């Protein structure tokens, strides 16, 4: 079908550069234009610039003119956006969106509209460095136990219980961003109180950015 | 500088609302290249109206657009719960440039509310033996997605060391959040108790832990 697929999440230091890609498929690539739009967390959409997929001509936003480069590769039907000298406030979700293109021979009624959008790419700019998590147990009719996944960077962290064999009553919460620049999250499982002495409960925390995996046994206090 | 939209608009099911988008004589007032976009939290925007008043294929006729002078307007008839989203206007600005509006958040009233469930854990002994202490307050199954968290030592408010997440949708149509209080082991053992107080729609749920 008609779709735009963007590259994965990026984690960069202040002053670095980042290059996000946007692969098109399902339509004639060189017949359209492609915008790049970004959105800070909780903020509005902001136009960065666009490119004609055919002749490659570009126009950038006056706020980004000095730092953004938008290119395209017709042989791969992919558009690219490079943002240089990154800073903290460049942390945002970045979208690519298709729009109309009219050539010279086009008298036609010119209409526009960002009709197809990519899924978005998160870019995180921070002076923090990669760090594995410290996992602490949260000891408990019904009873609640869990794990605390503290002080890790960057995202993401995956959590399962008993190697995935336990899904009932499990609730894993999105991470908080601490003032230190590190993340912390917690996972909960509600279990029968009758089982606290018989059944073993282990939370499996996986942080692939640091190649660390921790299986923390949570025991009654 | 951007296009001026109202920050929020509210309406009940069946009602009709209108979202304004005020520009200048260099964008909205001159060109018909005016579009409207609907965005649900965490998802990509979706074209709803283009060329001032035209709808793409499949878009319901409940959505309509118009323009008068420098102000474009988006009207949503027969408001439904699924229309709750952020709505953005966008206009051509000349010289091959485009500008977005500030964004408007549309809330649909009359939806059933749900009080939050709260679970509070004290610092683990392993963390205390590492000379650190963290209280974790976990909040789930509330709607709408807006809570305020306040912490208290015994009965005195404490603001230093509090980190709270934004609410996020669960697998059902409820929201979840969490709040963390970082403190030294001496502070934890100093007081008789600590409490996490979650306020939602004027009512509060409080849980307490003690050393």
């Amino acid at each position: 079908q008609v779709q735009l697929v963007q590259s994965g999440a990026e984690v960069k230091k202040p002053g670095a550069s980042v290059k996000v890609s946007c692969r098109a498929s399902g339509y004639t690539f060189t017949n359209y234009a492609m915008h790049w739009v970004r959105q800070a967390p909780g903020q509005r959409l902001e136009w960065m610039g666009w490119i004609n997929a055919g002749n490659g001509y570009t126009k950038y936003s006056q706020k980004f003119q000095d730092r953004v480069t938008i290119t395209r590769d017709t042989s791969a039907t992919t558009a690219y956006m490079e943002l240089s000298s990154l800073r903290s406030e460049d942390t945002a979700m970045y979208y690519c969106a298709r729009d109309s293109f009219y050539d010279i021979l086009s008298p036609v009624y010119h209409y526009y509209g960002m009709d197809v959008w990519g899924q978005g790419t998160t870019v995180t700019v921070s002076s923090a460095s990669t760090k594995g998590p410290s996992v602490f147990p949260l000891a408990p009719g019904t009873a609640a136990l869990g794990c605390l996944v503290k002080d890790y960077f960057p995202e993401p962290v995956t959590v399962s219980w008993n190697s995935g064999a336990l899904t009932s009553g499990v609730h894993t919460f999105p991470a908080v961003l601490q003032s230190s620049g590190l993340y912390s999250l917690s996972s909960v499982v509600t279990v029968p109180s009758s089982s606290l002495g018989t059944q073993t409960y282990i939370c499996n925390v996986n942080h692939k950015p640091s190649n660390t995996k921790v299986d923390k046994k949570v025991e009654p206090k | 500088s951007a296009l001026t939209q109202p920050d929020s608009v509210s309406g009940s099911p069946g009602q009709s609302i209108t979202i304004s988008c005020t520009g200048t004589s260099n964008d909205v007032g001159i060109y018909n290249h005016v579009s409207w976009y609907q965005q649900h939290p965490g998802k990509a925007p979706k074209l709803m109206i283009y060329d001032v008043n035209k709808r793409p294929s499949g878009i319901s006729n409940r959505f309509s657009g118009s323009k008068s002078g420098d102000t474009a307007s988006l009207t949503i008839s027969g408001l439904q719960a699924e229309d709750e989203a952020d709505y953005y206007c966008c206009s051509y600005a000349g010289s091959s440039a485009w500008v977005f509006g500030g964004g408007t958040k549309l809330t649909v009233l009359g939806q059933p509310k749900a009080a939050p469930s709260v679970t509070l854990f004290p610092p683990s002994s392993e963390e205390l033996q590492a000379n650190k202490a963290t209280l974790v307050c976990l909040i789930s199954d509330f709607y709408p997605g807006a809570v305020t968290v306040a912490w208290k030592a015994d009965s005195s408010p404490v603001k230093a060391g509090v980190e709270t997440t934004t609410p996020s949708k669960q697998s059902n149509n409820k929201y979840a959040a969490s709040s963390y209080l970082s403190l030294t082991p001496e502070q934890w053992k100093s007081h008789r108790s600590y409490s996490c107080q979650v306020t939602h729609e004027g009512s509060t749920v409080e849980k307490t832990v003690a050393p």
Binding site: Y57, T58, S100, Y109, Y111 | Y31, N32, S96
Partner: peptide, 8 residues
Amino acid sequence: NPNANPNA
């Protein structure tokens, strides 16, 4: 409704 696409 002018042509808005960028040029060289």
